[PDB]
Amino acid sequence: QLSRADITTVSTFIDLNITMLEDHEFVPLEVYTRHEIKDSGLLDYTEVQR
């Protein structure tokens, strides 16, 4: 009696590798926050009047 792995084996199937799409996490990103846009002005009427 001999084991099943003692004889050479050939794959009769046509392998098809399937790599699922990895999960992705999106982080917040802004070129200029609303605070930066407000600060872009040279003068602010609110602060000047205050």
């Binding site: 040279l42 003068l43 602060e47 000047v48």
Partner: protein
């Protein structure tokens, strides 16, 4: 300061109050002038010098 009370007469009273303050100056490109926290414009480059 105001003048003392003298009947049916106009009087002029001068008041001089020296004031010194620390203000945050701001400037934008080409940086040829800058403003102050009080809203006053200064037509001189912040980097002007000899």
């Amino acid at each position: 300061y105001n003048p003392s009370r003298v009947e049916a007469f106009h009087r002029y009273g001068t008041t001089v109050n020296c004031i010194v303050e620390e203000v945050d100056a701001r400037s934008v490109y080409p940086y040829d002038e800058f403003v102050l926290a009080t809203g006053d414009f200064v037509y001189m480059s912040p980097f002007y010098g000899y």
